[PDB]
Amino acid sequence: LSIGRTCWAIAEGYIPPYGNGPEPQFISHETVCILNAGDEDAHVEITIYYSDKEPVGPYRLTVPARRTKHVRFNDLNDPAPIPHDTDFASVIQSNVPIVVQHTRLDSRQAENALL
Amino acid sequence: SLSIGRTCWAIAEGYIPPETVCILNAGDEDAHVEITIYYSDKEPVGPYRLTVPARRTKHVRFNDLNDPAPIPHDTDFASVIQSNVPIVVQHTRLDSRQAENALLST
Amino acid sequence: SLSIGRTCWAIAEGYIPPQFISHETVCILNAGDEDAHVEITIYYSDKEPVGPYRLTVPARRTKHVRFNDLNDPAPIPHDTDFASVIQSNVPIVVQHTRLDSRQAENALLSTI
Amino acid sequence: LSIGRTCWAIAEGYIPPETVCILNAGDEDAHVEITIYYSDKEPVGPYRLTVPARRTKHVRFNDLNDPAPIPHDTDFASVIQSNVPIVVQHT
Incomplete structure (x- = not known):
């Protein structure tokens, strides 16, 4: 039923600078893969941290019960x-235990x- | 002997081209493993039974x-590995x- | 006030040799309200550890640190296998x- | 003044037709004992080796x-134990 935890941290974070076109296949498709093996919908809240400015508010998102969900930071x-070409970090929180990778x-x- | 590891593991990533789960049972009792595959759009696919004998290792290809x-190939999935006895999963x-x-x- | 992470981390691996290429970096996060006074120690396979490399990670901030820097x-020493230990006065997350x-x-x- | 733990396990192992990187940030030498596990036969005895205090050490499984x-071209696993805490990383 409930595997994982309700709080995860990722110290690394970077979306390489590209042009004004669609991000290339030879680029960091830095994604956050989440799994919710539980029976209750997961209401995830992501916070992005930077090296010079304050944290950017709650990025809400939901991961349905017994489902997985890849989340591209770029998206x-x-x-x-x-901001592309910027080193960032993130914190993922949920109401129910989830597994983050x-x-x-x-x-x-x-x-x-x-x- | 050794009862290293735990009875439950989860892998958020999973993808097969058109990945292997390495398991170690350093214990003295055979491990009756049950694997559950999760998807992004459909319900989990039932228990995939398998056994890892006492004091033995075993590499399981998801494709197998x-x-x-x-x-389904070319599909992003995730999995939950469970055992009656502690095992180490990588x-x-x-x-x-x-x-x-x-x-x-x- | 996320007091996430711990005050001590260790990395067994370490090795120094466009834009989309990554390298020997230690990404640190300090989601706390107190500045983080980090101390890094480098270990080698044949010689003693190299003293405290001080550095600070401000409260509620992240910071990537290139080992080369x-x-x-x-x-x-480049082309040298090393390892490191990261310590802090406050909990930080290291990756x-x-x-x-x-x-x-x-x-x-x-x-x- | 010690980081890590006295026991580590690696479920993956394979030498085709892999290195264990150890760190001993402590003040006492680490007497490491490695056990190799297989899928069809029993575990292969204690492989002794030492990691000096405040030192690191890469160990090729092949060595x-x-x-x-x-045995090459054979899937194996291992367990690394030490008298003192060490930090291990498979590569």
């Missing part, structure tokens, strides 16, 4: 989008060992 | 899982070599 | 990418 | 030979 926008590059980038 | 059903996602020598193969 | 007491995984990712990334 | 060398 975060409310309250605000994360940071990935610097998602699954389908590794799917390129094909040559 | 088939009963209740095979794991997962490696990015093969250092196969990645380091794929670059060479430009 | 460490210089006082002294710079870390480092396992050398192998790092090199590997950069390999896949490089690959056009 | 292990006493009691015996580790």
Whole structure:
């Protein structure tokens, strides 16, 4: 039923600078993979920390009971989008235990060992 | 002997191309493992039974899982490993070599 | 007032040799309300540990530290396997990418 | 003045046709004993080795030979024990 905990911290965080186009496959698709094996919906709140400015408010998001959910940091926008080419860190909190795992590059980038 | 590890483990990442779970049972009692696969859009897929004998290790390829059903490829999943006795569970996602020598193969 | 993390961390691995490439970095987070006075110690396989590398991580702030940028007491010999111990007066969260995984990712990334 | 613990386990192990990085930030030498586990046969005796006080030490599994060398192209696992706390990391 309830595996994991309600508070996770990720000291690393970085979205490489790109142009005004769609982020490239050769870039840090830094994602936060979350699992909620529980029977109650997980109301996740993410806080981003920086090296020079104050923390950016609660980024709400939900992870349905008995479900997983990958969250690209780049896709975060409310309250605000994360400044690219900036070192950040994050804290993930939930009402129910969840399992969190940071990935610097998602699954389908590794799917390129094909040559 | 040793009863290292725990009876419950969770792996948030899981993805098969068109990953292995390494388990160690340093204990004296056989480990009756039950694996549950979670998805992002559908309900969990039933208990995948398996056994890890006492004082033995065992590498389980997720692709080799088939009963209740095979794991859909090109699909992001997650898993929960449970045992009656403490076991040590580990997962490696990015093969250092196969990645380091794929670059060479430009 | 997130008093998350602990006052002591250790990294068994350590090794110094575009933009999308990462390297020997120690990312630290201090979600607390008190400034973090971090002290890093570097260990080697053949010589004694190199003194306290002081550094500060302000309350409610993060901070990435390149091992290469460490210089006082002294710079870390490149092409040398080392390890480190990070201590603080207040709880901090410390994260480092396992050398192998790092090199590997950069390999896949490089690959056009 | 010690970090880490006296026991570590590694579920993965494989030498194709892997290094254990240890750190001993303590003031007492660490007498490490490694046990290799397999999927079909019993565990292979104590592989002794020492990690000097305030020192690190990388140990290639391939370099292990006493009691015996580790069969290549074979999936194995290991348990690392010490008389004093050490920090271990598989690579």
